[PDB]
Each structure stands twice: as C-alpha cells, then as structure tokens.
Amino acid sequence: ELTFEETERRALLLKKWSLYKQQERKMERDTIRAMLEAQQEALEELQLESPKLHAEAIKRDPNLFPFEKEGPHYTPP
C-alpha cells in the first residue's frame, strides 16, 4: 500500500528525471553534431589542400576487428 504524498513525490521525480535526461540527450546530440561538423570541415580542408590525401583518409584501420577497451571502475590499481 502507498500514500498520496509518496505518489506525488514519485510523479515529481519522474518529471525531474524527464527534464534531466532530456538535457543529457540534448547535450550529447550537440556534441555529436559539433564534432561531426568539425570532422567534415577538416575533411573538406584536407581535400582542398591535398588532392592525394583524401583518397587515403577514407580507408579504415585494419586493427579495429579485434578491438578491446575496458570501462571505468572505482578504485584504480
């Protein structure tokens, strides 16, 4: 069983988390667009300043197939 005050607090928590993760997704998208357009303008400048390097800029590094990188922890070694 539950009361009215706790339900209202739950609704307020849901609203506040809505706002918080909305700002989170917004800032993530802003970073995505900013660095993507930075990379695109970098590629355009590279094409303009070097007609023989944009061909090799598009190729992918072949070492990404066995990619591996561990995440964060609490207490470092």
Binding site: L36, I58, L64, G71, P72, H73
Partner: protein, 108 residues
C-alpha cells in the same frame, strides 16, 4: 486494367523487401554482474543505434554460465561509415556506466 493509364496503381510488393568501405556483421557482447544494468545498457545502445540509423538485426543473449552468475547480451550491427564507426565506438566507450565488458567481435 493493363491498357489503362492507372495500370499497376494497386501494386505493393515492390514496396516490400521480404528476405565506399563498410564493415561486416558486428557483435557487441555485454557481460555484466547485474541483469538490470546489462538490460539498461542494452536498451541504451539499441536506442543509440536506432537513433543513428544502424541496421540492428538481433538483441539475443547467451545462456548463463556458473563457475554467482554473469548475464550476457548481444547487439547485432551492420552498416558503418568511416567517421561514423569512430563516433559510435567512442560514444559507447564514454557511455559505459560501470564495470561492463564491451566487444567488437564478429560472427562465428
């Protein structure tokens, strides 16, 4: 009718598909101590994929293994651009919450 200008106005099957360096099939394996954490991260990565327009095929799981148990999840990915793969992987790296193991392994 065949002779009429409206011929084929009702055809639909051509609108249904029932079956330049790019990657192949990519498996992201997520092993985690928490069912809740693994499920939440799978949801997050799936949302990132379908917001970035990535063809996601499967989101299944491996059977549990006991030697405590570790829950395993799989995300299937296909379709990557040069900078797109970099941004996707770096976002995953920066959004890994706590003590989860990623993977970029392939099929088989």
């Amino acid at each position: 009718y065949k002779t009429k200008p409206t011929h084929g106005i009702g055809k639909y099957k051509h609108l249904i598909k029932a079956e330049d360096y790019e990657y192949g099939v990519l498996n992201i394996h997520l092993t985690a101590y928490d069912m809740t954490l693994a499920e939440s991260y799978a949801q997050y990565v799936h949302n990132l994929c379908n917001s970035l327009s990535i063809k996601v095929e499967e989101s299944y799981a491996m059977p549990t293994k006991t030697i405590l148990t570790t829950h395993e999840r799989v995300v299937q990915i296909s379709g990557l651009s040069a900078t797109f793969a970099e941004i996707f992987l770096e976002i995953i790296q920066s959004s890994l919450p706590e003590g989860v193991r990623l993977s970029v392994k392939e099929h088989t």
